[PDB]
Design a binder for this molecule. Sequence first.
Ligand code: HEM
Ligand SMILES: [N]
Length: 184
Amino acid sequence: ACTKNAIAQTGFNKDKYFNGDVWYVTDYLDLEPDDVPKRYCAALAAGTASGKLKEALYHYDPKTQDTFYDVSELQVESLGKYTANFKKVDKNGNVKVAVTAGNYYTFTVMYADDSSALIHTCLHKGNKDLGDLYAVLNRNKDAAAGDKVKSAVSAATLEFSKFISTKENNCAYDNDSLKSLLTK
Ligand code: HEM
Ligand SMILES: [N]
């Protein structure tokens, strides 16, 4: 279960964050570390489509090769805090799993600037009991975390040394597919 009520960045600039570009997860912290320790790759595109706030997600396990995409329409809880009901789709936007009540994630933008961000996310999916997940994002897939985001992590009373990096996972991303999914 999730246990944190993350606080959104004061003065969060929604237009800059939801500009349709891609964000790559470079480091993450799972508060409920599973028993199965494996590498992982994730990226997302957030933007507006016909006035609606949307988010496209990509998950890739470099070991098992398990891959999946998701598209969600976001609902606003407050500035910087959203609730997303996701639908699983293929890379072309074709629906594989329709939106289902009870299947959603929340996400809070704790810090963000033109190239980096720190977010908190709580996933709710079926019977699986998931926990809080923090992620450091960057507009560049190979960028080391800068002083700005590292300080934000500290300011949130978190220890960056505990975060797991995805840089050595040999990740590959289909940016074009991610961007196109925003309209699906
Ligand atoms: C950047 C923020 C992320 C968001 C918003 C997010 C969101 C989600 C969503 C919505 C699903 C369900 C997809 C579906 O069933 O169609 C999912 C599943 C999953 N995510 Fe993430 N994720 C993110 C980052 C990550 C990262 C970095 C990891 C850590 C390695 C991760 C590991 C997983 C795993 C293992 C599952 C499968 C869980 C299951 O179905 O049993 N996610 N994620
Ligand atoms: N996740």
